[PDB]
Design a protein around this motif. Structure first.
Motif, PDB file in Angstrom:
ATOM      1  N   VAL A  18      -7.275   2.276  17.670  1.00 54.76           N
ATOM      2  CA  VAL A  18      -6.626   2.697  16.443  1.00 54.76           C
ATOM      3  C   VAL A  18      -7.577   2.468  15.287  1.00 54.76           C
ATOM      4  O   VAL A  18      -8.196   1.399  15.150  1.00 54.76           O
ATOM      5  CB  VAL A  18      -5.304   1.937  16.235  1.00 54.76           C
ATOM      6  CG1 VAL A  18      -4.753   2.168  14.850  1.00 54.76           C
ATOM      7  CG2 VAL A  18      -4.306   2.377  17.331  1.00 54.76           C
ATOM      8  N   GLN A  19      -7.628   3.433  14.392  1.00 56.34           N
ATOM      9  CA  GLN A  19      -8.441   3.304  13.214  1.00 56.34           C
ATOM     10  C   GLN A  19      -7.696   3.940  12.070  1.00 56.34           C
ATOM     11  O   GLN A  19      -6.965   4.912  12.273  1.00 56.34           O
ATOM     12  CB  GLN A  19      -9.755   3.998  13.369  1.00 56.34           C
ATOM     13  CG  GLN A  19     -10.852   3.350  12.600  1.00 56.34           C
ATOM     14  CD  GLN A  19     -12.166   3.758  13.205  1.00 56.34           C
ATOM     15  OE1 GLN A  19     -12.298   3.772  14.433  1.00 56.34           O
ATOM     16  NE2 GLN A  19     -13.123   4.173  12.359  1.00 56.34           N
ATOM     17  N   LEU A  20      -7.903   3.389  10.883  1.00 61.18           N
ATOM     18  CA  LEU A  20      -7.370   3.949   9.652  1.00 61.18           C
ATOM     19  C   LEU A  20      -8.464   3.894   8.611  1.00 61.18           C
ATOM     20  O   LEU A  20      -8.891   2.808   8.201  1.00 61.18           O
ATOM     21  CB  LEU A  20      -6.149   3.195   9.158  1.00 61.18           C
ATOM     22  CG  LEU A  20      -4.829   3.298   9.885  1.00 61.18           C
ATOM     23  CD1 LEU A  20      -3.794   2.424   9.177  1.00 61.18           C
ATOM     24  CD2 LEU A  20      -4.355   4.742   9.855  1.00 61.18           C
ATOM     25  N   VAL A  21      -8.888   5.058   8.159  1.00 60.87           N
ATOM     26  CA  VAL A  21     -10.020   5.176   7.263  1.00 60.87           C
ATOM     27  C   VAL A  21      -9.557   5.699   5.932  1.00 60.87           C
ATOM     28  O   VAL A  21      -9.166   6.874   5.833  1.00 60.87           O
ATOM     29  CB  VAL A  21     -11.091   6.123   7.814  1.00 60.87           C
ATOM     30  CG1 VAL A  21     -12.256   6.145   6.830  1.00 60.87           C
ATOM     31  CG2 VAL A  21     -11.470   5.688   9.235  1.00 60.87           C
ATOM     32  N   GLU A  22      -9.754   4.890   4.902  1.00 65.79           N
ATOM     33  CA  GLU A  22      -9.317   5.202   3.558  1.00 65.79           C
ATOM     34  C   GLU A  22     -10.412   5.813   2.716  1.00 65.79           C
ATOM     35  O   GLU A  22     -11.572   5.417   2.812  1.00 65.79           O
ATOM     36  CB  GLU A  22      -8.858   3.933   2.855  1.00 65.79           C
ATOM     37  CG  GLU A  22      -7.534   3.533   3.260  1.00 65.79           C
ATOM     38  CD  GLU A  22      -7.078   2.318   2.494  1.00 65.79           C
ATOM     39  OE1 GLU A  22      -6.946   1.278   3.182  1.00 65.79           O
ATOM     40  OE2 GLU A  22      -6.878   2.442   1.258  1.00 65.79           O
ATOM     41  N   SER A  23     -10.016   6.730   1.827  1.00 61.78           N
ATOM     42  CA  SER A  23     -10.887   7.160   0.736  1.00 61.78           C
ATOM     43  C   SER A  23     -10.066   7.548  -0.496  1.00 61.78           C
ATOM     44  O   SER A  23      -8.834   7.510  -0.477  1.00 61.78           O
ATOM     45  CB  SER A  23     -11.777   8.330   1.148  1.00 61.78           C
ATOM     46  OG  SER A  23     -11.035   9.530   1.257  1.00 61.78           O
ATOM     47  N   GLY A  24     -10.775   7.838  -1.600  1.00 63.02           N
ATOM     48  CA  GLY A  24     -10.179   8.317  -2.847  1.00 63.02           C
ATOM     49  C   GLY A  24     -10.114   7.341  -4.015  1.00 63.02           C
ATOM     50  O   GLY A  24      -9.732   7.739  -5.119  1.00 63.02           O
ATOM     51  N   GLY A  25     -10.498   6.107  -3.849  1.00 59.54           N
ATOM     52  CA  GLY A  25     -10.361   5.206  -4.963  1.00 59.54           C
ATOM     53  C   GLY A  25     -11.504   5.350  -5.925  1.00 59.54           C
ATOM     54  O   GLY A  25     -12.436   6.136  -5.736  1.00 59.54           O
ATOM     55  N   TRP A  61      -4.282  -2.081   9.667  1.00 60.57           N
ATOM     56  CA  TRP A  61      -4.543  -1.889   8.245  1.00 60.57           C
ATOM     57  C   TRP A  61      -5.793  -1.038   8.084  1.00 60.57           C
ATOM     58  O   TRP A  61      -6.735  -1.163   8.863  1.00 60.57           O
ATOM     59  CB  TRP A  61      -4.720  -3.235   7.533  1.00 60.57           C
ATOM     60  CG  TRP A  61      -3.529  -4.095   7.534  1.00 60.57           C
ATOM     61  CD1 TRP A  61      -2.963  -4.698   8.615  1.00 60.57           C
ATOM     62  CD2 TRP A  61      -2.784  -4.502   6.404  1.00 60.57           C
ATOM     63  NE1 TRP A  61      -1.876  -5.447   8.217  1.00 60.57           N
ATOM     64  CE2 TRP A  61      -1.752  -5.341   6.858  1.00 60.57           C
ATOM     65  CE3 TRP A  61      -2.877  -4.226   5.030  1.00 60.57           C
ATOM     66  CZ2 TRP A  61      -0.828  -5.920   6.000  1.00 60.57           C
ATOM     67  CZ3 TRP A  61      -1.957  -4.820   4.177  1.00 60.57           C
ATOM     68  CH2 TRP A  61      -0.941  -5.657   4.678  1.00 60.57           C
ATOM     69  N   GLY A  62      -5.793  -0.168   7.096  1.00 62.55           N
ATOM     70  CA  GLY A  62      -7.032   0.386   6.592  1.00 62.55           C
ATOM     71  C   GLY A  62      -7.896  -0.636   5.885  1.00 62.55           C
ATOM     72  O   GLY A  62      -7.496  -1.784   5.615  1.00 62.55           O
ATOM     73  N   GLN A  63      -9.118  -0.202   5.540  1.00 62.59           N
ATOM     74  CA  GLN A  63     -10.124  -1.120   5.007  1.00 62.59           C
ATOM     75  C   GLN A  63      -9.926  -1.471   3.533  1.00 62.59           C
ATOM     76  O   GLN A  63     -10.584  -2.402   3.049  1.00 62.59           O
ATOM     77  CB  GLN A  63     -11.537  -0.539   5.210  1.00 62.59           C
ATOM     78  CG  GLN A  63     -12.006   0.449   4.154  1.00 62.59           C
ATOM     79  CD  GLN A  63     -11.525   1.896   4.413  1.00 62.59           C
ATOM     80  OE1 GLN A  63     -10.608   2.150   5.214  1.00 62.59           O
ATOM     81  NE2 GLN A  63     -12.176   2.838   3.772  1.00 62.59           N
ATOM     82  N   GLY A  64      -9.073  -0.735   2.820  1.00 68.78           N
ATOM     83  CA  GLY A  64      -8.845  -0.925   1.388  1.00 68.78           C
ATOM     84  C   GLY A  64      -9.747  -0.048   0.540  1.00 68.78           C
ATOM     85  O   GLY A  64     -10.860   0.300   0.915  1.00 68.78           O
ATOM     86  N   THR A  65      -9.224   0.373  -0.609  1.00 74.27           N
ATOM     87  CA  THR A  65      -9.993   1.139  -1.580  1.00 74.27           C
ATOM     88  C   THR A  65      -9.580   0.642  -2.956  1.00 74.27           C
ATOM     89  O   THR A  65      -8.388   0.459  -3.222  1.00 74.27           O
ATOM     90  CB  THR A  65      -9.792   2.655  -1.393  1.00 74.27           C
ATOM     91  OG1 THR A  65     -10.721   3.354  -2.231  1.00 74.27           O
ATOM     92  CG2 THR A  65      -8.390   3.209  -1.735  1.00 74.27           C
ATOM     93  N   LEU A  66     -10.577   0.324  -3.785  1.00 72.35           N
ATOM     94  CA  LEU A  66     -10.353  -0.208  -5.115  1.00 72.35           C
ATOM     95  C   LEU A  66     -10.032   0.924  -6.096  1.00 72.35           C
ATOM     96  O   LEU A  66     -10.776   1.908  -6.188  1.00 72.35           O
ATOM     97  CB  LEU A  66     -11.598  -0.973  -5.576  1.00 72.35           C
ATOM     98  CG  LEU A  66     -11.451  -1.447  -7.002  1.00 72.35           C
ATOM     99  CD1 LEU A  66     -10.372  -2.499  -7.143  1.00 72.35           C
ATOM    100  CD2 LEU A  66     -12.828  -1.988  -7.401  1.00 72.35           C
ATOM    101  N   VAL A  67      -8.918   0.788  -6.813  1.00 67.65           N
ATOM    102  CA  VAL A  67      -8.545   1.710  -7.890  1.00 67.65           C
ATOM    103  C   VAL A  67      -8.671   0.942  -9.195  1.00 67.65           C
ATOM    104  O   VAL A  67      -7.993  -0.065  -9.395  1.00 67.65           O
ATOM    105  CB  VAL A  67      -7.119   2.265  -7.722  1.00 67.65           C
ATOM    106  CG1 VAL A  67      -6.749   3.130  -8.969  1.00 67.65           C
ATOM    107  CG2 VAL A  67      -7.031   3.079  -6.480  1.00 67.65           C
ATOM    108  N   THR A  68      -9.540   1.393 -10.087  1.00 68.57           N
ATOM    109  CA  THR A  68      -9.727   0.750 -11.383  1.00 68.57           C
ATOM    110  C   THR A  68      -9.233   1.693 -12.472  1.00 68.57           C
ATOM    111  O   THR A  68      -9.781   2.795 -12.644  1.00 68.57           O
ATOM    112  CB  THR A  68     -11.202   0.424 -11.604  1.00 68.57           C
ATOM    113  OG1 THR A  68     -11.618  -0.506 -10.610  1.00 68.57           O
ATOM    114  CG2 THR A  68     -11.397  -0.205 -12.966  1.00 68.57           C
TER     115      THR A  68
END
Lengths: 214, 214
Positions: B2-9, B107-114
């Motif tokens: 299982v993998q969850l890959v985040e983008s967009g932050g 869990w996905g790896q996280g993406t920082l939203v500033t």
């Protein structure tokens, strides 16, 4: 709403010690519906335990969970140096699902004094009008350290910032940077730049210094 | 697997909108309960949005009516479409596969939203040259960038042992600065070339800086 109160807030123990983390609920949590997560610094949480006592697949056997009702316990039977993290409990016996506030586990080791290094500003930075002098305290324990800057033996105040690394996963030490920021004009009016370091692993404070231009 | 890959932050202006994505493998988003969880700097985990296998959606009070969780069966992806962003929305956002409505098991790896009205700015990079005043230590000073993060590697990832990249500090200017240092064998300085690679995605800046003795 079931409020989960974790204790202690922080826990510092040496590898090989047993660590006991508590999660207490304001109301009964049905059917042992409580999970535990580990969050290492900079990483996503990972599931450790679900249903209070079931170890998740792939999780080391030193992690175990127990409890029922209003008191739940996460145990690390024998701590390893990579176990520093924040540990969270989470209940799913009622809606809304809620997390505890976390217990931070820190890994203790024997006292290690810092190696101290000093770096003058680079000629490339001076061209642009500011001067940063950097003092590095490398691979020490415990975290607490005092760094004082002297310019021509004059104690500096208000013009330095410090940063500390997360614990090293292998050897459990810290490293610290102290950066003194000066205008170019101020840097050129003075000769001796010195970082004085006080740490409990040192018998006496250590001064590292350089002369501008050498 | 299982993998969850985040983008967009990244950086977004207050009042703006931003869409986060989470591309799944090993399971079918459409047949699963999935959530977004966020974590403001220094704080705990806050569930934001959940979508049930059957399509029901639920939201935290602080985001209801201005965030939407959704999925694309065709691309096996989860989305969070955010609106009316404000500084309190600054956080690392995690996607997660839930086990039913119960716990968060991948869990996905996280993406920082500033969320900030300040302009992006890439860093200047200065050498911390090894001398006799620094086993030898050398590094790179990465100064005056906005927003976080930068990433630093040494010799394109070939050099990992002994590297300490410090947490960034907010300078009073409103810009960040950090140092990355490495300890290497003193014998090497003459022979081995040391390059820090500094990537700042928000500004599309990549700087390579050679660090050599003065």
């Amino acid at each position: 709403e079931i409020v989960l109160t974790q204790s202690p807030g922080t826990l510092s123990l040496s590898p090989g010690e047993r660590a006991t983390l508590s999660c207490r609920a304001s109301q009964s949590v049905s059917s042992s519906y409580l999970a535990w997560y580990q969050q290492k610094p900079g990483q996503a949480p990972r599931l450790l335990i679900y249903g209070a006592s079931s170890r998740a697949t792939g999780i080391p056997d030193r992690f175990s969970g127990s409890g029922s009702g209003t008191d739940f316990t996460l145990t690390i039977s024998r701590l390893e140096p990579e176990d520093f993290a924040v540990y969270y409990c989470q209940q799913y016996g009622s809606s809304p699902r809620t997390f505890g506030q976390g217990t931070k586990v820190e890994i203790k080791r024997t006292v290690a004094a810092p190696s101290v290094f000093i770096f003058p500003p680079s000629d490339e930075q001076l061209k642009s009008g500011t001067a940063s002098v950097v003092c590095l305290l490398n691979n020490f324990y415990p975290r607490e350290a005092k760094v004082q800057w002297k310019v021509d033996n004059a104690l500096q105040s208000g013009n330095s910032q410090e940063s500390v690394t997360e614990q090293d996963s292998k050897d459990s030490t810290y490293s610290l940077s102290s950066t003194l920021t000066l205008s170019k004009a101020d840097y050129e009016k003075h000769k001796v730049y010195a970082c004085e370091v006080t740490h409990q692993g040192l018998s006496s404070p250590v001064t590292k210094s350089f002369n501008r231009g050498e | 697997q299982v993998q969850l890959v985040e983008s967009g932050g990244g950086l977004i202006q207050p009042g703006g909108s931003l869409r986060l994505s989470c591309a799944a493998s090993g399971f079918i988003v459409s047949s699963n309960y999935m959530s977004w969880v966020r974590q403001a700097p220094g704080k705990g985990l806050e569930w934001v949005s959940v979508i049930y296998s059957g399509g029901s959606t639920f939201y935290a009070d602080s985001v209801k009516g201005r965030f939407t969780i959704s999925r694309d069966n065709s691309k096996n992806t989860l989305y969070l479409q955010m609106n009316s962003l404000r500084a309190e929305d600054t956080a690392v956002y995690y996607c997660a596969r839930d086990y039913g409505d119960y716990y968060f098991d991948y869990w996905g790896q996280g993406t920082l939203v500033t969320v900030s009205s300040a302009s992006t700015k890439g860093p200047s990079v200065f050498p911390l040259a090894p001398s006799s005043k620094s086993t030898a230590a050398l590094g790179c000073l990465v100064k005056d960038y906005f927003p976080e993060p930068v990433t630093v590697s040494w010799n394109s990832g070939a050099l990992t042992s002994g590297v300490h990249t410090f947490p960034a500090v907010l300078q009073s200017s409103g810009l960040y600065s950090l140092s990355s240092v490495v300890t290497v064998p003193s014998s090497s300085l003459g022979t081995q070339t040391y390059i820090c690679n500094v990537n700042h995605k928000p500004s599309n800046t990549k700087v390579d800086k050679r660090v050599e003795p003065k």
